[PDB]
Design a protein around this motif. Sequence first.
Motif, short mmCIF file in Angstrom:
data_model
loop_
_atom_site.label_atom_id
_atom_site.label_comp_id
_atom_site.label_asym_id
_atom_site.label_seq_id
_atom_site.Cartn_x
_atom_site.Cartn_y
_atom_site.Cartn_z
N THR A 111 40.90 45.52 51.47
CA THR A 111 42.13 45.36 50.31
C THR A 111 43.76 46.50 50.21
N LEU A 112 42.80 47.55 50.10
CA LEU A 112 44.34 48.89 49.35
C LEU A 112 44.86 48.85 50.97
N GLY A 135 42.31 49.31 58.84
CA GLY A 135 42.86 49.41 57.21
C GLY A 135 44.10 50.91 57.78
N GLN A 136 45.15 51.09 57.15
CA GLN A 136 46.12 51.73 57.40
C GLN A 136 46.56 52.81 56.26
N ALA A 137 47.00 54.61 56.00
CA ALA A 137 47.34 54.87 54.82
C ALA A 137 48.58 55.85 55.30
N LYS A 138 49.09 55.96 54.15
CA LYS A 138 49.55 57.61 54.77
C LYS A 138 49.10 58.88 54.79
N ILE A 149 42.57 58.94 49.74
CA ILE A 149 42.95 57.00 50.69
C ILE A 149 44.73 57.45 49.75
N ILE A 150 45.15 58.32 50.51
CA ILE A 150 46.84 58.30 49.64
C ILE A 150 48.02 57.17 50.17
N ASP A 151 48.35 56.00 49.44
CA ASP A 151 48.53 55.21 50.34
C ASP A 151 48.60 54.25 51.48
N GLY A 152 47.85 53.62 50.87
CA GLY A 152 46.86 52.56 51.30
C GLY A 152 48.55 51.51 52.16
N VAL A 153 48.50 50.71 52.59
CA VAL A 153 49.17 49.92 53.48
C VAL A 153 49.17 48.98 53.27
N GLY A 154 48.24 48.22 52.77
CA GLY A 154 47.86 46.86 52.00
C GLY A 154 48.91 45.88 51.35
N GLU A 155 49.10 44.24 51.23
CA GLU A 155 49.90 43.91 50.87
C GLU A 155 49.26 43.96 49.12
N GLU A 156 50.47 44.12 48.54
CA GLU A 156 51.02 44.48 47.13
C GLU A 156 50.23 43.08 46.50
N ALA A 157 50.57 41.88 46.78
CA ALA A 157 49.92 40.35 46.32
C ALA A 157 47.82 40.67 46.19
N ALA A 190 44.68 51.61 41.66
CA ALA A 190 46.00 52.00 41.63
C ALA A 190 46.66 53.22 41.70
N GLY A 191 45.56 54.12 42.47
CA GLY A 191 45.58 55.77 42.55
C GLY A 191 45.88 55.62 44.55
N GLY A 192 45.82 54.65 44.56
CA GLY A 192 46.12 54.09 46.13
C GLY A 192 47.59 53.89 46.54
N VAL A 193 47.75 52.26 45.83
CA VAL A 193 49.12 52.28 46.15
C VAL A 193 49.91 53.19 45.64
#
Length: 193
Positions: A111-112, A135-138, A149-157, A190-193
């Motif tokens: 999900t993240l 999944g993807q991340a920065k 995992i820094i900055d996952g690209v998942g949907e905020e909602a 919370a850390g992943g966003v």
Amino acid sequence: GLVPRGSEGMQFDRGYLSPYFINKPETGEVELESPFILLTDKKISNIRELLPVLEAVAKAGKPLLIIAEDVEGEALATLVVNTMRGIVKVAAVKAPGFGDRRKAMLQDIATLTGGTVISEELGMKLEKATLEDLGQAKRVVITKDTTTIIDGVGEEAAIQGRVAQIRQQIEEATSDYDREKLQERVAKLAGGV
């Protein structure tokens, strides 16, 4: 208590499955930039299972982080040979935790990162996993014993909905241990966003 900083990244205690993934020799770390992330609760022992994804990843020209139950034997060896030659920039780590918490945490990362878990029980095959399943991340930073995992690209909602779900469980929890472990998950998301 308050947390002074913000998005340090979702971290779990599982490090690189081979020292040959290390691409930061002075720190003894793996640093992947804009990596695709493969998520699975299956044990990868054979290379036939990873070929389709590796070919796709190689064709896209993007790094890959494999999070599985375990990645061993011939499978791990083929990742090592392909990464050493520069055909693919891969790194494999074990999925965090065990039992039911591992599957829930695999879903938390899905999900993240906007990925899909290739689940053993559903009958999903690694062979058919596509780029949309990943999944993807920065950035991904893997040390000897941790993965971040820094900055996952998942949907905020979607990420928000996952945290609401964990809060819901916390309310229904019967132990401080259960609430604490559930609290962990929220903090990791919370850390992943």
